[PDB]
Each structure stands twice: as structure tokens, then as C-alpha cells.
Amino acid sequence: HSVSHARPRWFWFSLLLLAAGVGIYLLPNR
Incomplete structure (x- = not known):
């Protein structure tokens, strides 16, 4: 796997x- 279903907030x-x-x-x- 190349981080396809594990992206935090890069995009x-x-x-x-x-x-x-x-x-x-x-x-x-205020």
C-alpha cells in the first residue's frame, strides 16, 4: 500500500x- 487509505491532512x-x-x-x- 502507498498510503492510499491512510492520509491525515496532507490534502x-x-x-x-x-x-x-x-x-x-x-x-x-473581541
């Missing part, structure tokens, strides 16, 4: 960076 890196922005948008004024 979700850009997605994680977007999740952090969503949390700041919920608390951008």
Missing part, C-alpha cells in the same frame, strides 16, 4: 488554514 492543509480564518471571523472584534 486538507489549505482546508485547515480556512478553518482557522472562520474561527477568527467569529471573534474578530
